[PDB]
Design a binder for this molecule. Structure first.
Ligand SMILES: CC(C)Cc1ccc([C@H](C)C(=O)SCCNC(=O)CCNC(=O)[C@H](O)C(C)(C)COP(=O)(O)OP(=O)(O)OC[C@H]2O[C@@H]([n+]3c[nH]c4c(N)ncnc43)[C@H](O)[C@@H]2OP(=O)(O)O)cc1
Ligand SMILES: CC(C)Cc1ccc([C@H](C)C(=O)SCCNC(=O)CCNC(=O)[C@H](O)C(C)(C)COP(=O)(O)OP(=O)(O)OC[C@H]2O[C@@H]([n+]3c[nH]c4c(N)ncnc43)[C@H](O)[C@@H]2OP(=O)(O)O)cc1
Lengths: 357, 354
């Protein structure tokens, strides 16, 4: 099996969102990933279940439990993302796992954490980011907050911190010879994800007013603009030298505009930039500014990404069943990753305990 | 030093956004982190570091740097491609003085290809791979999700997964290697769920018309009587039904939860209901509930929130609050971040390491 995480053995108790996204990446990088789903369901639809062996097993039954408990015994990592108490009351808790394998990295993916008042509440991405200030900061100032899909709570502030915890604990287990419990809460990870704003907030460089900051769309030089065809460009020309390059491509003379960072005159500035970008279509701007430091790029829809040169040449995507999918990231010089394998039709848990000798 | 990464040694060449964030998290978890800046701190992102100066273009500045890297486990650089090569700090020069080094390259566009030398920021990397187009209301231009998705989630976090996966690989092979983390790639994997969903006909390229983009009335924010907001995330029918009951809404009178043609009508009924009381009222009503209804707090209110206070998600420092390390560890727990450690001379650090 190809990739830097070759050898690594992972047990994933089937859940939704972060838990599986973490498991995918471990797989992606060559870990051996075994997912136990409920029998009361089931070759899979979700391309998120790539780089995976799937096994049936009713964990409520006494048999199901011990089979599971065997897999965990011969494995490096356990991933679960159920509310607190669920694995305990199944007989798969940390304390129970530590008795068949004190090397186990016990990885617990939740929104709210393992304790505290909200620890039993149901929730999704949007709820976790609502409590820690993030959601309030996203969207235009004249309107209600808009959810950044489930990118910030589930994945960026959830799965990815689960991965860092798993892999940091594996580094630890090289010294001490023992595993441990990784407690990944989306509300905490997403908070560290936005540490920049907490830092800027302290030094007067970020306010709580939505749509009135450097990076939220309030700056006319860091925002999207509608073009003549109703498609969009993005502008991220923060540094003055890049902003100057953008102005020249737009045909605007700096002498006729207000200063880039005079906020009181951002309305005028925005109006000027808006009229300029509105006068040609996205693909015009795309050409004018390619190879340029103007920080102006076309805003592509998913369906167009496969035609973008830089995306094609670096193989950011591969084809798989009437749909493109992202190739693993990041990339490794010596132990490169493979193309992911599609979800691996169900298997029997004995066959896996056997294969794992 | 407290944390699961005690005695990991990390050299960081100073830049902006992702590279510093990754270095921060490494520090947060107990790693020894030395950051080389240029002779020309306030940012709390520079927490859990030692800062040193060094003209990397001088003969001596370079010599010193290579003496650090020789002793360290990980090097982090976030410059445009070619930049570290020309300084004399490229992968191959580093592999001469330390074949074990994990060499971590943090860019937006990647190491090669047509845009590889183009300046950019977060908003640009996510414009090219479909992400930015997908965010915001439908009647309107896309809105940047701050720089959470390219710099951090699709950026620093993938650098970290790569640094630590390469540390694992090393333990079996004795050898370092190069980690190429590009924000346009990481952010693409970060949104793999949408790519899966699109392949099976359960996501469209229309903005504001999906389960998770704000187009679903059960997955969106709502304005309340006081002008503040709640978030609703009641995807599962049982959670949704719990929410209707607490709103005072008889299910029989409403359109089906998932009849999309009638979402606008559904949304107008839920809008009226949420508008009729203040945000704090809904926070009370739905506490301990599975209704998936939560107050949308502004940054300055977060320190007053029970679940935040009691789990110590933040700590106080300097101006105000900062996030404590994540994730958390049972045995080898992280400590409260140290503020940034004012300029020390780089020779000191070298005697301190062997
Ligand atoms: C493809 C797309 C559409 C899917 C999708 C993706 C993403 C999302 C959004 C955006 C997200 O944010 S996903 C994140 C949700 N939050 C979390 O994951 C945080 C922690 N988890 C939770 O809070 C819960 O799992 C939650 C999702 C909220 C609610 O789930 P629930 O109450 O139905 O389940 P629960 O976790 O409390 O308990 C599970 C239940 O199942 C049982 N179980 C598990 N496995 C098996 C098995 N193999 N055989 C038999 N029984 C089994 C457990 O024992 C337990 O039973 P119990 O006795 O307690 O009732 C939504 C949907
Ligand atoms: C707090 C706020 C204000 C900060 C802030 C945070 C975040 C953001 C947004 C949201 C972001 O997206 S940050 C991410 C930006 N993109 C990237 O980092 C991707 C990779 N990097 C780049 O593309 C570029 O570094 C770029 C950010 C575009 C800026 O380009 P640049 O030309 O200024 O720099 P470059 O990388 O081309 O070369 C740097 C230059 O510095 C020199 N350097 C470094 N270290 C030293 C040293 N110790 N002593 C002497 N010289 C030194 C290098 O030698 C090099 O010089 P060169 O001779 O080649 O011109 C914006 C601002």
């Amino acid at each position: 099996m190809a990739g830097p995480l070759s050898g690594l053995r992972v047990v994933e108790l089937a859940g939704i969102g972060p838990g599986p996204h973490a498991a995918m990446i471990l797989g992606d990088l060559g870990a051996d990933v075994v997912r136990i789903d409920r029998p009361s369901s089931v070759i899979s639809r979700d391309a998120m279940l790539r780089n995976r062996r799937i096994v049936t097993a009713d964990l409520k039954s006494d048999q199901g439990l011990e089979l599971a408990l065997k897999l965990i015994a011969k494995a490096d990592v356990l991933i679960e993302g159920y509310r607190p108490g669920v694995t305990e009351r199944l007989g798969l808790g940390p304390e129970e796992c530590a008795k068949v394998n004190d090397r186990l990295i016990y990885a617990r993916m939740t929104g709210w954490g393992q304790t505290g008042p909200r620890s039993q509440q149901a929730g999704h991405d949007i709820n976790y980011i609502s409590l820690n200030g993030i959601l309030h900061a996203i969207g235009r100032g004249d309107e209600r907050p808009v959810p950044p899909l489930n990118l910030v709570g589930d994945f960026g502030g959830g799965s990815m911190f689960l991965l860092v915890g798993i892999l940091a604990a594996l580094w630890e287990r090289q010294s001490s010879g023992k595993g441990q419990v990784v407690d990944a809460a989306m509300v905490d990870g997403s908070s560290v994800l936005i540490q920049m704003m907490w830092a800027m907030r302290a030094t007067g460089m970020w306010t709580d007013t939505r749509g009135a900051n450097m990076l939220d769309g309030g700056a006319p030089y860091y925002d999207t603009y509608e073009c003549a065809d109703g498609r969009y460009v993005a502008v991220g020309a923060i540094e003055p030298q890049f902003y100057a390059a953008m102005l020249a491509g737009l045909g605007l003379d700096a002498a006729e505009l207000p200063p880039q960072n005079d906020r009181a005159r951002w309305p005028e500035l925005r109006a000027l930039l808006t009229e300029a970008f509105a006068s040609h279509d996205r693909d015009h701007w795309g050409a004018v500014f390619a190879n340029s430091d103007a920080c102006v790029t076309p805003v592509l829809a998913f369906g167009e990404v496969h035609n973008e040169p830089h995306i094609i040449e670096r193989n950011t995507f591969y084809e798989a069943n009437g749909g493109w999918q992202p190739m693993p990231a990041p990339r490794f010089s010596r132990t490169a990753s493979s193309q992911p394998r599609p979800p691996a039709a169900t298997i029997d848990i004995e066959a896996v305990l056997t294969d794992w000798d």
